[PDB]
Ligand binder design. Structure first.
Ligand SMILES: Nc1ncnc2c1ncn2[C@@H]1O[C@H](COP(=O)(O)OP(=O)(O)O)[C@@H](O)[C@H]1O
Ligand SMILES: Nc1ncnc2c1ncn2[C@@H]1O[C@H](COP(=O)(O)OP(=O)(O)O)[C@@H](O)[C@H]1O
Ligand SMILES: Nc1ncnc2c1ncn2[C@@H]1O[C@H](COP(=O)(O)OP(=O)(O)O)[C@@H](O)[C@H]1O
Lengths: 370, 52, 370, 370
């Protein structure tokens, strides 16, 4: 029989999860595995050593870090297995998968074996009765309380723009390129060795990401802020050293506009979005220029939206309105939209029974996902 | 200090602690465009019977 | 079955011993090995010449001394065996080899062949059921109770700093310099010749060591105190004499920070410490700037820790609360922590399966050497 | 001038130099610093207090050794001044710092600050008519006469592999490990005390270098040779003593393939190079399987090639023919390629007026090197 819904999110960078009727997911933590990095010798401390969570969020140069879900694509299935099992903790779930409805978040344009394999997990290892995974775009629209809109994200290493009209769209008109913040930190690391800054460990890179998320802004003027002379302001270390920065703090996030510099023939969110709009109706595009949605936590910056609108207005059509500013929390909004969807009443249509799923396979999965 | 008396090696005056002197965002108010508010409950009420 | 083991704390020169779960090492004395420097004919003496124990202090000016445990490494195997046999005396032990297990100390970074030959001795000549030997830093951990931290211990001729967090090793991070008080007494002897003296005899040198461990301290300031002139306090002479000292008494342990005085491209205690700090995560360093306690009587000096703190301030980065940690147990602390250890589940997971051990050869635990 | 510009094999471990058209780097010497270890008092001794040449590496026990280069990058610029004065010695040139253009070498992925610092010295101390510095990889293919290929250098500063398609470099595909044979020597010293060998001096270090280049070799089988029952051959020490060898003679160079054993996170030179191949086109790699170039002094080992071949065999793709070159001069060839470059009239962009440097600085050279 029906039970209490569990609102979980496939967090590319940081996984998010909670239950129905809540307002904030109480379980938000990174997407890696922390296993023994050093020589564990004398007994008397916390052992098992494959520690993920507050210990990993606390002890850094002690456990090797391994991310299995890169570009929203899980490669180390076993890692997500025990990652999910960590989600089943007394710290985290305290319940059983086989007794409550669980909502998760689908990632656009991925293979079938992924979700099929996951379905096999939660229907064989776990035996979840009610399970569904879907797009956060409509959820974001519920957060706006609107129906039409073009949802753009910035995950861990994922970006995609979706034109939407009341939950009716063209699948051919959607655009997607897996790229975000993690690679930005990678390019930051490039700048580091470009000016000789030795940063290559796992946790070391995590620290670099913290620096990236903190000591970086978005300079709207490209050449005007690149051709000049910097000051190379310094920022502390957890250890305590305050090291210089320079133009790099805005050069690395502005790289999204030029994948050619990273050796990539991409198009950039601006062109990505524009082309997505180009793949649509004619007069309806204006309505959609008004209704546009932003998402993804990598979007977090200063001089961000103004730079975006600057690009947009450089390639704008005949003066059409644009409306996407800073809501409460874009990431949370997706989870909150999951809570919204969990609050549905005719929600029974979001799944098939386990027994029938056993009699279904990939068939019902793709015949009912779309 | 029972055991300490038997210790020929005892000298005081320095403690056994290492403690010297002690001395103890625009993605929110972007004036660029407009955004939405959270409003969970009333949004569900707004979308109350908007099912299939 | 009931066989209380014996905690035997070896060392550079000194050896300590007492059964498991005790509180004070029942018998303690150094590596002094003596035999008559003269010729006796008339009856009344003793015969055998291997007269080591309280008789040595009772008969200092009669025998020749030696210390075959060079830098904690045995040379005169036969003599060490005799030493251990002296330990096996009734009033010294009253127990047999097979009757009880034994715990022992491992000075790291030494040839394991020493341990090989010794293991063969205690498990073939003597037939102890099990004998475990281990890192002296672990002993300090049990004495402190803490599991995180570095420990630099110093006997009479060896100093080693062990940085280990939560009882979990970082072998590369460990550092050492093997030189201590022995040469400081020799340095004192050099100063004596500068003062016009010579105490070339073995027992004479022992008296010199008594002066060393008796008439010394550490001046916090090197030159600020070196440019002045003391009153040259006098030391009582077991000869019923008394002779001046000079500022040398504290100037002599400056070698601990200056190998220049001995003329060797070495570094320094604080330098070893700093390098071990460099050899770790940028995180734990600050945290481990509180969990360090040093052992051994080589630390029993007036102005020891204070001058060391001055060195810390000169070398450590800014704003880290670090004063100095030292108990009055630093000598015995090793044996004490070893007793703490041995009074537990040691034999439950770590010991020598004597029979099977030699059946599999000594290389078996020499593979389990860590 | 109508004569030979200064060709300098700016060597990591051993720096060499000569001129254009010539095929002999007339002067070769390591990157050390020779000052004294003692103070002459006797009137009529040898003086200078700064020594290079054979006299420097003669009285090692009398001359303080200080290697000034770090990861292929010196930081002791004063020593470089003195080094270049020795380069300008009567034994070498008897020339001026204006008579010929200067060609030096480098490694990529370095701070531009080095190039800055360099040219600052080269023009504040010298009045060089033309200065240029680049990658030896170009010069390497010049020595091979090829156009494309991947070259991995093994110097004592940095070991780095560069993929090359007719000079059209792929900065997003070059790999660079900062390991050296110096660390292997240090690692050998670890084996020394493991085997009980008391060595810590700077003078001993060069003896270990002789051991490295002579007593060490490469064992092709990775773990099959790890279990070989050693015989511990004995090397007769040059002073007159003799010391055993053990399996360490091939164990230590394997750290270059298993850097994690020392704690350095990397993937082994072989895999790193394969990753560089992976950072490229698809069928152009097929050419690179035939295009395999060896470089660096830290490649001269008995067993080196074939073992590395087996490494490649494990890293081999699906049934693709692979050709591997092995030049004789894995170092000197670069100097000769530089002599070829200096023998070019098309050196137009490379020759830079000093006045131009006064006008802009190293940035002007960065435009040329980028
Ligand atoms: N201050 C910040 N600046 C930029 N990005 C941030 C900041 N804080 C967090 N993030 C981003 O959060 C993202 C994590 O992916 P996210 O957008 O959360 O997708 P998901 O919810 O699927 O994990 C990372 O890409 C990272 O850039
Ligand atoms: N009162 C003292 N003053 C100075 N040094 C001392 C004193 N007592 C002992 N020592 C030195 O400290 C060392 C104790 O450290 P420990 O490791 O127990 O020594 P050992 O290695 O000889 O057992 C002794 O070897 C001795 O050289
Ligand atoms: N015969 C040899 N066998 C092994 N290694 C060698 C030999 N000769 C030189 N080397 C290595 O070469 C390194 C010196 O760096 P090198 O290759 O000379 O770079 P560079 O020429 O740029 O200075 C040292 O690490 C040394 O071990």
């Amino acid at each position: 029989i029906a039970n209490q819904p569990v609102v979980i999110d496939n967090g590319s960078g940081v996984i998010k999860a909670g239950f129905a009727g809540d307002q904030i997911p109480k379980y938000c933590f990174p997407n890696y595995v922390g296993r023994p990095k050093h020589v564990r010798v004398m007994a008397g401390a916390l052992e098992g050593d494959i520690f993920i969570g507050p210990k990993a969020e606390e002890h850094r140069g002690l456990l090797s870090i391994r991310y299995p879900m890169e570009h929203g694509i899980v490669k180390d299935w076993n890692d997500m297995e025990r990652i999910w099992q960590y989600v089943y903790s007394k710290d985290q779930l305290q319940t059983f998968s086989e007794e409550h409805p669980v909502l998760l978040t689908e990632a656009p344009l991925n293979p079938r074996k992924n979700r099929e394999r996951a379905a096999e997990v939660f229907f064989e290892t776990f035996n979840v009765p009610a399970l569904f995974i879907s797009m956060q775009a409509v959820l974001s629209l519920y957060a706006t309380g609107r129906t039409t809109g073009v949802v753009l994200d910035s995950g861990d290493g994922v970006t995609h723009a979706v034109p939407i009209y009341e939950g009716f769209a063209m699948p051919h008109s959607i655009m997607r390129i897996d790229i975000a913040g993690r690679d930005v930190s990678r390019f930051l690391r490039l700048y580091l060795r470009k000016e000789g800054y030795d940063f290559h460990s796992s946790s070391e890179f995590e620290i670099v990401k913290a620096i990236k998320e903190r000591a970086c802004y978005l300079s709207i003027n490209p050449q005007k802020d690149e051709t000049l002379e910097t000051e190379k302001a310094q920022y502390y270390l957890p250890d305590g050293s305050t090291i210089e920065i320079g133009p790099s703090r805005f050069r690395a996030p502005e790289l999204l506009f030029r994948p050619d510099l990273i050796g990539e023939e991409s198009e950039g969110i601006h062109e990505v979005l524009v082309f997505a709009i180009q793949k649509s109706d004619m007069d309806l595009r204006r309505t959609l220029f008004s209704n546009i949605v932003l998402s993804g936590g990598s979007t977090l910056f200063k001089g961000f939206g103004d730079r975006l609108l600057s690009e947009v207005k450089k390639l704008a059509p005949k003066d059409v309105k644009i409306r996407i500013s800073a809501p409460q929390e874009r990431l949370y909004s997706t989870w909150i939209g999951g809570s919204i969807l969990a609050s549905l009443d005719t929600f029974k249509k979001m799944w098939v029974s386990k027994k029938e799923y056993e009699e279904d396979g990939a068939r019902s999965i793709h015949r009912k996902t779309f | 200090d029972p055991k300490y008396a038997d210790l020929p090696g005892i000298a005081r005056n320095e403690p056994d602690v290492y403690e010297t002197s002690d001395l103890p965002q625009e993605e929110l108010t972007s004036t660029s465009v407009e955004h939405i508010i959270v409003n969970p409950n009333a949004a569900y009420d707004k979308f109350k019977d908007k099912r299939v």
